[PDB]
Amino acid sequence: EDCDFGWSPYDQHCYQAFNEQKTWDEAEKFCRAQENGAHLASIESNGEADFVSWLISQKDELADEDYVWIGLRAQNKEQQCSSEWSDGSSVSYENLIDLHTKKCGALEKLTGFRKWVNYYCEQMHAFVCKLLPY
Amino acid sequence: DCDFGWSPYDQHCYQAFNEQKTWDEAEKFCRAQENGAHLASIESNGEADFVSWLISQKDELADEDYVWIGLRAQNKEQQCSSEWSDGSSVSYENLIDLHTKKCGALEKLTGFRKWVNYYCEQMHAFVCKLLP
Amino acid sequence: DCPSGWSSYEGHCYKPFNEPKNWADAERFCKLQPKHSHLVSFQSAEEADFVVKLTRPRLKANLVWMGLSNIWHGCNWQWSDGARLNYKDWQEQSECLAFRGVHTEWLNMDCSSTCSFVCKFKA
Amino acid sequence: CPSGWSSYEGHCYKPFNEPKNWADAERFCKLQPKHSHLVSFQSAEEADFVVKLTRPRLKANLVWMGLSNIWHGCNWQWSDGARLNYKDWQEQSECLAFRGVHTEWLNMDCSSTCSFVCKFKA
Incomplete structure (x- = not known):
């Protein structure tokens, strides 16, 4: 218990x-x-969403950041998650060779760091860690 | 029947x-490719040998040391031991400067037959397999 | 065989349309055809090549819808810490897939974007 | 903690400079008067303590920790969904070590020889 220096x-x-x-x-x-093993933040209620948005807003160095990673991650192995075409046939052939994975979740400046959006996992952004101290 | 370029x-x-x-x-x-191929799975010694030969006959691959096949670790963790030798569970871990080895490759040193796990983001030749 | 203005490839008929529409309106336009059709699906590279040969002359460099929608739903999103994903607060947006009338490679687009399209049915 | 062992948060630790492979090190720890195991790290603060302990005599030697065969139990599967019946893996196992001056983990062959630290609960 007790948050260490630097943690809120x-x-x-x-x-x-x-x-x-x-x-x-x-x-x-x-x-x-970090500490006893933190993770990218999970957001489990409206009050926690408010808190995380506020925490990012308190960080002066994050002033120009557009995205901040949180711990939402797609577990489906496919690179796009529609497994049927509108005509009902199954997807086999795919031509995704020019595209990059969008299977990671983030908070975004455009919407006040509240609503979740998916974005490109391999892009470098600020992030928020969440710990249960012990 | 196979299409042009395939064996x-x-x-x-x-x-x-x-x-x-x-x-x-x-x-x-x-x-x-074609009707949707995948990285090769290798389901027998005879297939293991054929894929080795296939690789050996690609003259462009002379300087190549690893070739990707379709083996992929599904466990989400960066290393797959969930308990310490003392029985305690792993939570803290410091894997910051270490890259994980969660993809399977064939390797020149072992004649492109034995499977080795290797770093997924490394760039290497590869073999596709399909049903025609 | 295929009606006038449509093109034949391995038992199916295809027609490109230039009128830009969002995904849902495009798919509905194909569904309203005299033979009920759908946005194009690709089952092979050779099929995609044929389709781009169709789109190249009049659709040119325009974006073209294909029949895959809401591609980020169904990804089995979970929390890295193993917490239950009960509370949700996703932005209300969806993405659909498109190609360029010039090239077969797929592209992700907001489903409310207006693009050209190609309809397809089995003859 | 008994003579030659150093105390931290209710546990006892001792570094060893004699190079051993992972399995032999773990065995050695088990065979000490108080049955111990290769060190485990439950926090960054614990890792910092251990590195303070190792730095003097082990130095920049690699030092084993109690994680072994780290690439086994990864649920390997084929991307095409074929059954993984036939297996043709190279026989190699990796285990984790740290440098005796920094807390960053390094994957090593388990048959390499490293220094190590033992640990038990007081």
């Missing part, structure tokens, strides 16, 4: 927003290396 | 591509 308490968890810009995977790895 | 073996068609791509991009490229 909300309910039973500790949180910190980092302006280090990292891919989704690197950000999750970095959080797991 | 038949036991009811499937195979092609080695020399374009170096990450495991994910290689798989995406296979899906864009």
